[PDB]
């Protein structure tokens, strides 16, 4: 096949990055994100990215999906910021929540110029890095309702 | 304002509303005309197929009859969903490596004929990956028209590693029609192709070891199944059950020199940077109706293991609703205001023309 005459000829381009960076400017949740070292957490709630209050950071509803932005100083420069972005998928989260969390993780990555390294964290499969962010890790029963309308 | 999501498969239209958990209209992507030489679309054409010759406007993921495709879209909007398209932003889908003119003409028709207020054309496999809750993985998407291998890392498809095989469900149906003649059955016409398609979907499976299965089929009738045709005749099928989808692993069954789906998957992974290959091998996501054969995931797991380094951790993800994964991924993404922010508006089309699709849709 010939990529150049095809519908993927513009994938991987500066143009693709520019369009997606612009789109990420339209999510209020990212304003002010990643400005200092620490952990910031949002939960997906009926397709919306909703902040989790700091007093609850580390507690996750098993029925829900979340985005966790870890901002830290890299070894290369103690006065600059680098990022790990984890999306945490509860054992009982619904498909809309997990899919939004994945898409919005990429969007936060775009917003932060591609710098975040992404980590998919399924409940019970959390990475060593995720476990290191927090007896701060607590799983809560229940969660918020799906954003999907069910087709009978 | 609710967006419409329309996944135009080569064989099936799946259409509905963003935010629903499933497409509300699913029907064959066919136009029927009198077999005796004015047209019917979709479910009604399938019903009246006794007196019609059926044609698919999409072949191998590319629209080849634009007049009939317009009939399909018109039917989707006005007869199935019963919506006024000018009131609904519309998400369409497409397989990768299609010629650029296909989406240019999709865009032109949506705006100039259907007057949609906004639209976007998304890559099918990318939607499926998001439907699975991932940003990294390699999707094997196989419908009626095309089998695609799409590796994606951190939300970006890797164009140099995307692969495409113009062998999928319709070719499998045609091959079953052919091999069924060995038993003395005659399936030839377009109406008969739809019967054999049903036989394929109901009775076919992927053998874990093809040669062993052929021996089992000859030793006794233990693998045979019966099927009642619409005229009442009952036929029996045996090794055709697994010889049909074996073609995915041995394309030479239909005369193609191409590598089988296990080898294309491996080849696509090998075109990716070495450091991400382990993540791709652990995240093979199956998508599409042609991935629905019983046994296919186990066979993939076996064949990729044989090709991959001996210690590679390999996992095949086979979502139960994978016939609708593309649609579901579109329903999710079209529910996000930021994704809709990238859509082409009617004004943008008026000023820029079809070329704008390449600058907005990735
Ligand atoms: N259970 C099944 N086993 C085998 N094949 C099946 C099964 N169910 C559906 N198929 C086949 O899958 C195809 C339709 O699936 P699907 O709707 O995913 O494809 P499509 O979107 O029309 O095609 P494409 O995306 O390649 O253009 C047909 O060939 C159909 O016969
Ligand atoms: Ca939930
Ligand atoms: Ca990144
Ligand atoms: Mg399809």
Author numbering:
A (entry chain B): 7 to 140, 143 to 160
B (entry chain A): 5 to 41, 51 to 375
Text of the article:
Actin is one of the most abundant proteins in eukaryotic cells and plays essential roles in various cellular activities, including locomotion, division, and transcription control. The dynamic assembly of actin is controlled by the hydrolysis of ATP, bound to the center of the molecule. Upon polymerization, actin undergoes a conformational change from the monomeric G-form to the fibrous F-form, which is associated with the flipping of the side chain of His161 toward ATP. Here, we report the crystal structures of the three mutant actins bound to AMPPNP or ADP-Pi determined at a resolution of 1.35–1.55 Å, which are stabilized in the F-form conformation with the aid of the fragmin F1 domain.
